[PDB]
Design a protein around this ligand. Structure first.
Ligand SMILES: *[C@@]1([N])=N[C]=NC2=C1N=[C]N2[C]1O[C]([C]OP([O])(=O)OP([O])(=O)O[C][C]([O])[C]([O])[C]([O])[C]N2C3=[C]C([C])=C([C])[C]=C3N=C3C(=O)[N]C(=O)N=C32)[C]([O])[C]1[O]
Ligand SMILES: Cc1cc2nc3c(=O)[nH]c(=O)nc-3n(C[C@H](O)[C@H](O)[C@H](O)COP(=O)(O)OP(=O)(O)OC[C@H]3O[C@@H](n4cnc5c(N)ncnc54)[C@H](O)[C@@H]3O)c2cc1C
Lengths: 397, 444
């Protein structure tokens, strides 16, 4: 019988357990398979079992033999079980060899001479960049009509160019029909071609990890197998919360950290934090250079009928690029003309994963783009490019 | 006759010249050296200095780094020149400018002869600074003694570089040349290195420099320089140091060699051109921008001087030296030491009820990706209103991150916003979640 139980070792549950322990509460963390910073705490018991609900109030602990070892309870339970790679139903998967998801690839024994990636998502493009830099010939197959479709399209054109210049082969409108393996190698059979590879990466998305007997509970699932949560991350049973990837939406480590803020606010604070007031959420696609994003693209701003102005700056026009010895990239911003507020930004270039946080703060705090234009920046840096990136007049659309 | 005369191809000058020309005005820009097209930063300052620091961090040799420094300097010098000269409303005049009167400027060739004279209703003095040559016995006879600019053009890698001076520029050359394999000794006359900086963070730079093999000394009075033919000895009160090359880096003074006696332009206690809050000299139609008017010597201060002068001559005159906002800066040692606002010593001396909180870079998970555990992040907060008084970031990406805290200070964003914000991951910026967490609720 505990004070708080978190199920899973994600970021939200781990930091929530550490906070509750400093309060003095006795916490139970259930994790099937950093590590000491939780166990070594006097007020936290990490249980190496598999969690499975017996009711809305008690949780069964299963050993590796799927036997019930013990049952545990607490007035509040946090579900934080993450997600798993989506396995595609294709011909010859269970028999094919040298096939990997994202986790299996990160633990690969060898460097592939030819890595084929089925899937063209952000994670897929990241791995293609990481392995081209390591000398691997990389082919990636996208089923859709274009790469990174939710991103600004003449920025991604620069990204595709820089990816191709590294020897990466991109393909669009590719249906993959069959996988076969001649033992040491594996061939991917597609609509356009049949590629031979040393390793095949399945990178076609992650689906919530919802395996803990929800039939014994009143916890509901949404359209896509995610745990349904309200604005305070409450499931349909009010004393049980869901955080991280196991509920729907954005799958980021920092979103999981913000989930802890919401749940702590609901359980220990004034309950003012919700999923409706996270502020603008930035993200980075770690290609080379990194593509960082926050707010709208100009395509979205035009679709929502903003009176907007967009402006761009090639990284080759940024003098700091000469010190970096890297001319690749494109910086792009979208501005609201009514006020002078920033609607969104796409920074494709070095330091973009750091610079993007400046624009995030400006959007949240209603700092007009004129302030970023006229500000004093350190020199020589990439940040000082904001003197030029935001140096423009209204073009009224 | 021109509409605007700019004396010196500095940062404020070239930027103001380019704007006025877009307006339709005819601008004359006087620059004495064709090796100086673009200013001190492009040719003998920030750009060549940090090109060598960046390349030395990458394992490039001395010869390879210096060759790429030449290409980068030559490319930007040529770029800066044509950005101005090719404008139909800007004439770049290759002469030394000297005032004939309050209203017209002589153009002198390198033999100090007057070739012609020009005039304009507004004149901008943007002549920068020069290295302070110290009065030391044997300097005018010692060999292998270098400027900051002489060192950036050195034709050999020194086995032992001895640095007279311990300012920011001196420590940047020490780190730069240590990373290139040179043995470096640096000598500071004062009691301590980098005063006015958070001396807790300074002790980190010091140890990180010493762990690279840099020898540092304080309370050192350099009394004499002597040289044989291939070695130079620096005679001090503690020791004699034998060197391949000696760097004199003890500050830079305003360059006012403009025959100001033919004008009513006044000079201040420290040889600077006196200016008001709108950067007007004591002659109202003459402005002074950049290093020559004293104060902070940075390229971005010079760029902000263009904003003040443009505001005064073309805009609503609201921009002054009194509303620049908080001024960040970076000392480009390895990793860079970046700073904005008050030090905790300053906050304590003014009697704030302040909170200081630090975070070691080795406690930032991104450092493992960076392959560098060195650094210390530090913030100083006013406890009565949660405002950010200052910060010192010593670590990777600090020269970028410091601009976030600058923005927060200027806009009166309380530290709790930076503490609770969502940051990209994995980054150095997300360390702010911990750096700005004072753990007030960490109790029973
Ligand atoms: C049961 N039944 N009982 C006990 N414990 C259980 C259990 N089922 C599962 N588990 C355990 O639960 C945890 C879950 O951990 P985690 O971290 O998945 O939880 P959470 O809070 O949802 O975290 C989400 C977050 O980690 C994730 O979004 C990021 O990893 C996303 N991400 C990312 C992901 C992949 C797959 C790759 C290849 C790369 C990246 N890169 C980034 C990136 O650069 N930035 C970013 O912000 N996010 C990235 C587990 O231990 C189970 O055993
Ligand atoms: C080694 C070193 C490293 C530095 N690193 C950095 C750094 O990393 N970041 C940073 O922000 N700052 C840095 N600085 C400072 C920066 O170089 C200066 O603060 C800045 O360039 C000042 O520019 P300015 O507008 O005052 O004029 P300057 O850029 O100094 O230009 C003045 C110009 O006027 C010309 N001139 C002078 N007198 C006459 C005359 N009579 N007639 C005609 N022309 C004339 C000169 O030839 C020169 O081209 C560094 C400085 C040095 C020395």
């Amino acid at each position: 019988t505990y004070d708080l139980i978190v199920i899973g070792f994600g970021k939200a549950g781990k930091t929530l357990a550490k906070y509750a322990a400093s309060t003095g509460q006795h916490v139970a963390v259930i994790e099937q398979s950093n590590y000491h910073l939780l166990a070594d705490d006097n007020n936290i018991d990490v249980l190496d079992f598999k969690a499975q609900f017996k009711s809305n109030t008690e949780v069964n602990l299963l050993d590796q033999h799927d036997d019930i070892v013990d049952s545990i309870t607490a007035p509040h339970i946090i579900i934080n079980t993450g997600a798993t790679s989506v396995i595609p139903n294709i011909k010859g998967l269970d028999q094919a060899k040298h096939v990997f998801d994202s986790t299996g690839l990160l633990n690969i024994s060898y460097q592939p001479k030819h890595l084929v990636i089925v899937g063209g998502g952000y994670i897929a493009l990241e791995f293609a960049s990481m392995f081209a830099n390591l000398g691997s010939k990389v082919t990636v197959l996208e089923r859709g009509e274009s790469f990174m479709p939710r991103e600004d399209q003449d920025v991604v054109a620069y990204g595709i160019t820089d990816l191709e210049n590294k020897g990466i082969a991109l393909h669009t409108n590719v249906e993959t029909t069959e996988l076969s393996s001649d033992n040491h190698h594996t061939t991917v059979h597609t609509n356009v071609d049949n590629f031979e590879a040393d390793a095949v990466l399945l990178a076609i998305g992650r689906k919530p990890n919802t395996d803990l007997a929800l039939e014994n509970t009143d916890i509901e699932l949404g359209d896509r197998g995610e745990i349904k949560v309200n604005a305070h991350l409450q499931t349909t049973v009010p004393h049980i919360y869901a955080a991280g990837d196991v509920k729907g939406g954005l799958q980021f480590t920092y979103i999981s950290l913000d989930d802890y803020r919401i749940i702590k606010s609901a359980l220990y604070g004034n309950q003012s934090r919700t999923t409706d007031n996270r502020g603008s959420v930035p993200y980075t696609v770690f290609i080379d250079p990194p593509l960082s994003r926050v707010g709208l693209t100009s395509k979205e701003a035009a679709a929502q009928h903003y009176d907007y102005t967009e402006h761009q700056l090639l990284v080759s026009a940024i003098p700091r690029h000469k010190i970096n010895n890297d001319p690749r990239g494109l910086f792009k911003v979208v501005i609201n003309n009514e006020n002078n507020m920033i609607l969104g930004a796409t920074l494709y270039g070095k330091q973009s994963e750091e610079l993007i946080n400046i624009i995030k703060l400006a959007i949240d705090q209603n700092i007009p783009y004129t302030v970023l234009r006229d500000n004093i920046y350190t020199h020589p840096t990439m940040a000082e490019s904001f003197n030029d990136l935001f140096n423009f007049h209204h073009h009224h659309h």
